[PDB]
Every structure is written in C-alpha cells, then in structure tokens.
Amino acid sequence: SGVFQLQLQEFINERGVLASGRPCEPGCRTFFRVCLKHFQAVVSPGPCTFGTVSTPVLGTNSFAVRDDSSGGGRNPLQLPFNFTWPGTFSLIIEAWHAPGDDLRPEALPPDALISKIAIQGSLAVGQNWLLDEQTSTLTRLRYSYRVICSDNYYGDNCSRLCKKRNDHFGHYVCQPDGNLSCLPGWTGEYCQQPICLSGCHEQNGYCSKPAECLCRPGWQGRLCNECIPHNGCRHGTCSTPWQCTCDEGWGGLFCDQDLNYCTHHSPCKNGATCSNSGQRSYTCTCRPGYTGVDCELEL
Numbered sequence: 001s002g003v004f005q006l007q008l009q010e011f012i013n014e015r016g017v018l019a020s021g022r023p024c025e026p027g028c029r030t031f032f033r034v035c036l037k038h039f040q041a042v043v044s045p046g047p048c049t050f051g052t053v054s055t056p057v058l059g060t061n062s063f064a065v066r067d068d069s070s071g072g073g074r075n076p077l078q079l080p081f082n083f084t085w086p087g088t089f090s091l092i093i094e095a096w097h098a099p100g101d102d103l104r105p106e107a108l109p110p111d112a113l114i115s116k117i118a119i120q121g122s123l124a125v126g127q128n129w130l131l132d133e134q135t136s137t138l139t140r141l142r143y144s145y146r147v148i149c150s151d152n153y154y155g156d157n158c159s160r161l162c163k164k165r166n167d168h169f170g171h172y173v174c175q176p177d178g179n180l181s182c183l184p185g186w187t188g189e190y191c192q193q194p195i196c197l198s199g200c201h202e203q204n205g206y207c208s209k210p211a212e213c214l215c216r217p218g219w220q221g222r223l224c225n226e227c228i229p230h231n232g233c234r235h236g237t238c239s240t241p242w243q244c245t246c247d248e249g250w251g252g253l254f255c256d257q258d259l260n261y262c263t264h265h266s267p268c269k270n271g272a273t274c275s276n277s278g279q280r281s282y283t284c285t286c287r288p289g290y291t292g293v294d295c296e297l298e299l
C-alpha cells in the first residue's frame with residue numbers, strides 16, 4: 001500500500017488554445033484530471049486502476065502553480081492505494097478548460113480539452129521527487145511525482161504502523177524504519193516499564209515512574225535502603241525494620257528510659273555535682289554557700 005503524489009509546477013499555453021486549435025474564451029481556465037493505472041505497453045483505454053483525482057482551476061493560459069493550490073508544492077495531488085506498489089505505472093494528465101464554474105465531466109463539452117499527456121514510469125518508494133516535463137503540440141507541463149507511505153507507516157510495502165506516544169500506554173518516538181525508540185527513563189517491549197532511580201533497592205524499593213524510588217513497608221531513604229525503627233521508638237535505631245536498639249544511655253523497649261538524667265538534662269546550677277536517682281530523677285550536691293533542689297539558692 002502507499003500514496004502516489006504528483007506536483008504540478010508549470011503549464012505553458014502561450015496561444016491560449018484548445019486541443020482543437022480554437023481559442024479559449026476569454027482564456028484557458030485550466031484545471032487537470034489525473035488518471036493513474038498499472039503499466040501497459042501500448043496506451044489504450046481502460047479503467048484507472050489506482051484511481052483518478054482532479055484539480056480546481058489553477059491558472060489561465062500560461063501559469064506557475066501556486067504553493068497553496070491542489071497540486072502545488074505544499075499541497076500535492078494524492079492517490080492512495082491499498083495493494084502492492086508494482087514499480088511500473090502509466091500516468092495520464094489531462095489539461096481542461098472550464099467554460100464556467102461546473103467542473104464535473106457531465107457539464108463539460110468534449111472540445112474543452114486542452115491537452116492529454118501520457119507518462120510511462122518506473123519508481124521505487126522513497127522521499128525524493130522525480131522531476132519531469134512533457135511538451136505537447138503548443139503546450140508544455142512541468143511536474144514531479146513520488147510514492148511514499150501514508151502517515152505513520154513505514155517499510156517498502158508501508159506495512160509497519162508506528163505512532164509516537166507519551167502516556168500511560170507507552171513512551172517512545174518512531175525511528176525512520178518504523179521501530180520504537182524509548183523516551184529516556186523507559187524500557188520494556190513497548191516502552192511501558194520505568195527505570196528506577198539509580199541505586200533503588202531491588203527488594204525494598206520500586207518505581208512506577210522513571211527516576212523515583214518508592215519504599216516497601218519498613219524502609220526509608222532515597223534508595224529505600226534504611227530501616228524504619230518501631231513506631232514507639234525514641235532514642236533508638238534499627239538494622240532491620242521495626243527494631244528499637246537503644247542509643248548509649250537509654251533503655252526500655254522504646255528506648256525512652258533515661259539511664260543518665262544528669263548528663264542529658266544538666267539540672268544542677270552553681271557548679272554543683274549531679275547524681276541520678278530512680279525515686280526523684282536526680283540529686284544536686286551543692287558547693288559551699290548554695291542550697292535548693294538544683295543548688296540555685298544562695299545560703
């Protein structure tokens with residue numbers, strides 16, 4: 001399958017005459033009918049096996065085709081086809097005069113024909129336009145053509161569908177041959193599998209988006225490689241999840257029992273000496289001249 005494209009570039013008709021030799025009135029308002037068919041050795045009537053396409057009026061007498069027009073460089077004529085491109089082809093381009101605004105073949109008399117141009121060709125699929133020119137009796141047509149794949153199709157038979165996407169169902173662009181290429185951060189057959197933050201822990205962390213690391217229960221840190229201590233744990237750490245290994249100077253299952261109230265709180269004042277107590281928290285031994293709970297009162 002594919003699409004035959006045809007550009008019409010320039011048409012010369014300096015006498016402004018029909019194929020009959022009679023002058024167009026008031027000038028040749030020129031449109032084109034295009035018939036594309038399978039190659040045959042001798043030009044003979046028969047159906048247009050690749051189809052027909054027609055243009056509006058593109059100019060009068062002699063003219064260069066504007067880029068906007070159907071047939072111009074930015075809007076070429078297109079004949080799509082579903083079967084195998086046979087390489088060789090016969091192409092018929094008819095220049096017609098429009099005596100009015102009705103371009104249908106039923107409205108036109110047969111002597112409105114300006115010229116009939118037959119082209120025998122052989123072409124491979126590809127992006128390059130082949131330029132050519134045909135001079136009839138008193139007219140001349142410059143045109144160019146090529147065969148390409150319809151949009152998002154690739155391969156010499158245009159059988160490979162690729163269209164880029166960046167959503168929940170895939171993250172990729174299309175290479176020239178129609179094969180996926182993943183956007184950065186993604187892998188998997190259809191570029192749906194995220195690549196986690198480098199270092200993400202293979203058991204304790206995972207990702208759903210590229211370059212993140214989500215932790216499984218009991219783990220923390222950017223790489224999900226650090227255990228979480230027990231929910232009640234105070235002055236304690238862990239090696240594996242939910243432990244509570246007390247810091248130096250603390251005890252209990254939740255590492256909240258102060259094993260050195262004196263150092264951790266420094267209650268005593270005026271240079272007194274602190275000692276721990278299980279009944280009263282601590283005791284301050286005053287220097288000479290001081291009294292009180294914390295030796296804060298001067299004797």
Ligand SMILES: *[C@@H]1O[C@@H](C)[C@@H](O)[C@@H](O)[C@@H]1O
Nearest residue numbers: 271272273274285286287
């Ligand atoms: C503890 O006792 C008090 C009375 C002060 O003499 C301190 O210097 C000492 O460490």
